[PDB]
């Protein structure tokens, strides 16, 4: 959306749906050709198949997100927000929960669909206990 | 810097120097043709010059920054951080401060210098806060 408030509300709803773990509902928030860059500097994920794989991987990892303040850009489409993500590695037989402190930047269409997400987190943004 | 900890330590210094009000020292942390886009979307300063227009008006605005956690990109150069910036309230200079909740994204050089900064904040990211207990 181009209205800041409404734009933020769509991102808030995205995090609610990540938390709910409902892949189909999450994927439908994105445009069909939306790109996801997670982490920033690795391979860009592009289109529906890649989104699906990425969100299945997140729900499988039992991700929970606690978002910080949602900041709007003044470009009619961006939202940027620091978050704490917690998740489990499904290959770890101890299923140990890890925290990642990340920053997400979204851009949205004027109809309110997400068309890019970039996720900043590095090796040194990961914590345990 | 390509090493995440080093890259972060540099941005940590940037905020320290901003809070110190030392325009000389701040401007220097940038490269010659660094772009500062603040706010994102009403772009886009470029150049050693406009970085002094920039840093001088921050000092004039009595800006203080409280950064949160510094996250790194895995692109060998980005740092991204949510912060709270407080400054003078011109509508009520003496009684209140304006607070903006923003996200900064920096990209840095392999030497340690800032090439770009995009500061995300909107009209809905501004609060007014009590400033004195007179």
Numbering used by the authors:
A (entry chain A): 1 to 129
B (entry chain B): 1 to 134
Give passages from the manuscript.
To provide a structural framework for understanding the activity of SalBIII, we have solved the X-ray crystal structure of SalBIII at 1.8 Å resolution. Phases were determined by molecular replacement. There are two protomers in the asymmetric unit, consistent with the fact that SalBIII is a homodimer in solution. Each subunit adopts the cone-shaped α+β barrel fold first recognized in the structure of scytalone dehydratase[10a] in which three or four α-helices pack against the concave side of a curved five- or six-stranded mixed β-pleated sheet, creating a largely hydrophobic active site cavity, closed at one end. The most similar 3D structures to that of SalBIII are those of the MonB-type epoxide hydrolases, but sequence alignment shows that in SalBIII one of the two catalytic residues (Asp38 and Glu65 in Lsd19/LasB N-terminal domain) is missing, and overall its sequence diverges significantly from other members of this family. Using the crystal structure of SalBIII as a guide, eight residues were identified as contributing to its active site: Tyr14, Asp38, Arg45, Tyr54, Asn58, Ile65, Asp104, and Trp121. In contrast, alteration of either Asp38 or Asp104 (to either Ala or Asn) gave wholly inactive mutants. These residues are suitably placed in the active site to operate as a catalytic dyad, to accomplish both dehydration and oxa-conjugate addition. Superimposition of the modeled active site structure of Cyc11 and that of Lsd19/LasB C-terminal domain[10e] onto the active site of SalBIII shows that they occupy exactly equivalent positions.
The enzyme SalBIII from the salinomycin biosynthetic pathway resembles other polyether epoxide hydrolases/cyclases of the MonB family, but SalBIII plays no role in the conventional cascade of ring opening/closing. Using this metabolite in vitro as a substrate analogue, SalBIII has been shown to form pyran ring A. We have determined the X-ray crystal structure of SalBIII, and structure-guided mutagenesis of putative active-site residues has identified Asp38 and Asp104 as an essential catalytic dyad. The demonstrated pyran synthase activity of SalBIII further extends the impressive catalytic versatility of α+β barrel fold proteins.
